[PDB]
Amino acid sequence: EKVDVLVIGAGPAGTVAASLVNKSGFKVKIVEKQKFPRFVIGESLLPRCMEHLDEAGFLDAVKAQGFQQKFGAKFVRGKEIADFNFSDQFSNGWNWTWQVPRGNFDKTLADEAARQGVDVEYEVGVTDIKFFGTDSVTTIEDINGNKREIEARFIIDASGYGRVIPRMFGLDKPSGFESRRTLFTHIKDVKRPVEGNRITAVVHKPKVWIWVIPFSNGNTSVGFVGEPSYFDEYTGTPEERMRAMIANEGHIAERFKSEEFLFEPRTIEGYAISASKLYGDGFVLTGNATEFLDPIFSSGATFAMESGSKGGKLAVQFLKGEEVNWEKDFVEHMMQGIDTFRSFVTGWYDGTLHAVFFAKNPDPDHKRMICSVLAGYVWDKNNPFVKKHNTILKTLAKVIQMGEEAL
Ligand SMILES: Cc1cc2nc3c(=O)[nH]c(=O)nc-3n(C[C@H](O)[C@H](O)[C@H](O)COP(=O)(O)OP(=O)(O)OC[C@H]3O[C@@H](n4cnc5c(N)ncnc54)[C@H](O)[C@@H]3O)c2cc1C
């Protein structure tokens, strides 16, 4: 009923945010609305998150789980292949990370946090927040419908898709990206190749792509993402449709034909969304309670940990009575990273990026710089592709074509 920081959500955002707060002696609580383990989408991590996993002391717990290691991202268009190796990049920093079922991953983290001294309470869903200056009174509901209040010096809203605070005080801002649909499931990957240390993204149609994410449990997450009109071209049950879409892609058709699905395929549409501000008196937003761009380059959970870390470190500065420039130490920081992936998303969809990816004799320096963007090092200002992100793709692609005509 009385705490320094109330963390809403036991996802990677709130677990990382919580650990860092606890690490500095304060009293911090996570209320998690679901029972863990609990399914959520967003399974392919980036090397950059290893930084926060390391700082929060989660690395050992995660390693013990034996998740599938990830050494890069592979892009397929027909038979054209562009393999990015995280071991060859412009930036210093981590060169490898994990593909993880989020149920098990997010429980590993939460459970480590609790152990660390964080008190984690499950099956208790926020329902109302009332602010008095920077102090707050939060009401939770347990599984039995009974309500109780929590008093805090600060709320870190790590509610992800719940968008707890953004919805309570109307902080939702349309994204700018146009609506897209997704269909996905896990597949028992009996016919998996003997490679494996990659996420693979498949250029299926002009504006449709697919993700193939290998886990260490025998299964493989597969998801179609793209233009909604495309999905309407298939008729039938989620499973029928899903098996139909796979059958229409040469790169995976035979591999997944007839293989078992761990669960009926799920849809997510209009997943792009932003916030009018990322913080206010008594709170900061994190992860998906901030802004989600697009799944292409698998960054969501890394942004959630990055923002959870930053908001965590900053909320400690607040509690200590230090001056905090949220605009500069938080917002500007999240947007630098978020604006970088934005440019690469746009370029994924507008044709420019593909031209770079599938250029014959791609420059190996450009490749490296691009590779550090894919690894999450989108704060490295020395990396021209970070420096010039809203320009370089369109610019590079023109230069490529100029090269094509010459010959
Ligand atoms: C199709 C698709 C594919 C994606 N692929 C990837 C990917 O390969 N890699 C990647 O990094 N990201 C991916 N993402 C993004 C990703 O899913 C998120 O970035 C990630 O889950 C966000 O972490 P989070 O901690 O911010 O929120 P969440 O992971 O959603 O967790 C928030 C927690 O808050 C809890 N909660 C919600 N409401 C309340 C409440 N009222 N009270 C208490 N608790 C509450 C929830 O139960 C939840 O546990 C993908 C997204 C989509 C749509």
Is the CB of residue 376 below 6 angstroms from any atom belonging to ligand 1? no
| Strand segments (E) across 115-216 | 119-121, 124-132, 135-142, 147-157, 172-173, 181-188, 198-205, 208-214
**159/138 Cα distance (integer angstroms):** 14
- Cα three-residue angle 187-188-191, rounded to 5 degrees: 105
Residue 314: exposed, middle, or buried by beta-carbon count in 10 A (0-12, 13-18, 19+)? Answer: buried
User: What six digits make up the tokens of 334?
Assistant: 């999240």
User: What six digits make up the tokens of 362?
Assistant: 């791609």
Name the residue among 107, 15, 45 with its Cα closest to residue 307.
15
Question: Phi then psi for 328, rounded to 5 degrees?
Answer: -90, -45
CA–centroid distance, residue 128 to ligand 1 (Å): 20
Residue 44 per-residue DSSP state: B
Element spanning 168, H or E = helix 164-168
Is the CB of residue 158 below 6 angstroms from any atom belonging to ligand 1? yes
Name the residue among 113, 112, 151 with its Cα closest to residue 132.
151
* Contact by Cβ (8 Å): 159, 169: no
Name the residue among 16, 92, 80 with its Cα closest to residue 54.
16
Residue 242 per-residue DSSP state: H
Strand partners, 283: 155, 280
Please report where in the chains the tokens 């009018």 appear, as a residue: 276
Q: Which residues contact 277 (CB under 8 A, 6 or more apart)?
A: 171, 331
**45/28 Cα distance (integer angstroms):** 26
* Contact by Cβ (8 Å): 272, 175: yes
Q: How many CB atoms lie within 10 A of CB 395?
A: 12
Q: How many CB atoms lie within 10 A of CB 295?
A: 23
Strand partners, 140: 126, 148
DSSP three-state, residue 83: strand
As a residue count, the chain comes to: 407
Name the residue among 26, 72, 75 with its Cα closest to residue 47.
72
Task: Specify the number of domains making up the chain.
Answer: 1
Name the residue among 389, 299, 406 with its Cα closest to residue 344.
389
- Cα three-residue angle 189-195-200, rounded to 5 degrees: 75
**138/183 Cα distance (integer angstroms):** 36
* Contact by Cβ (8 Å): 87, 368: no
**CATH code of the domain containing 370:** 3.50.50.60
Nearest protein CA to atom 4 of ligand 1, as residue: 42
User: What radius of gyration do the chain's Cα atoms show?
Assistant: 21
Question: Phi then psi for 105, rounded to 5 degrees?
Answer: -65, -45
Is the CB of residue 33 below 6 angstroms from any atom belonging to ligand 1? yes
Residue 261 per-residue DSSP state: B
DSSP three-state, residue 185: strand
Which is it for the CA torsion 111, 113, 116, 122, positive or negative? negative
Q: Which domain holds residue 318?
A: 1-407
* Contact by Cβ (8 Å): 16, 30: no
Is the CB of residue 282 below 6 angstroms from any atom belonging to ligand 1? no
| Strand segments (E) across 196-237 | 198-205, 208-214, 219-226
Q: How many CB atoms lie within 10 A of CB 3?
A: 19
* Contact by Cβ (8 Å): 146, 295: no
Name the residue among 28, 121, 45, 126 with its Cα closest to residue 86.
45
Residue 323: exposed, middle, or buried by beta-carbon count in 10 A (0-12, 13-18, 19+)? Answer: exposed
Please report where in the chains the tokens 């939460």 appear, as a residue: 110
Strand partners, 279: 284
| Strand segments (E) across 283-392 | 283-285
Is the CB of residue 287 below 6 angstroms from any atom belonging to ligand 1? yes
Name the residue among 303, 337, 402, 321 with its Cα closest to residue 11.
303
**200/214 Cα distance (integer angstroms):** 9
* Contact by Cβ (8 Å): 38, 122: no
Residue 212: exposed, middle, or buried by beta-carbon count in 10 A (0-12, 13-18, 19+)? Answer: buried
Q: Which residues contact 206 (CB under 8 A, 6 or more apart)?
A: none
Question: Phi then psi for 231, rounded to 5 degrees?
Answer: -65, -30
Q: How many CB atoms lie within 10 A of CB 26?
A: 17
Is the CB of residue 101 below 6 angstroms from any atom belonging to ligand 1? no
Residue 40 per-residue DSSP state: -
**261/360 Cα distance (integer angstroms):** 37
| CA distances for 61 relative to 54, 216, 311, angstroms | 11, 16, 23
User: What six digits make up the tokens of 1?
Assistant: 């009923």
Mutate to test the pocket of ligand 1, among 30, 41, 104 (most ligand atoms within 8 A of CB): 41
Residue 178: exposed, middle, or buried by beta-carbon count in 10 A (0-12, 13-18, 19+)? Answer: exposed
* Contact by Cβ (8 Å): 42, 169: no
**290/167 Cα distance (integer angstroms):** 11
Name the residue among 233, 14, 11, 195 with its Cα closest to residue 106.
11
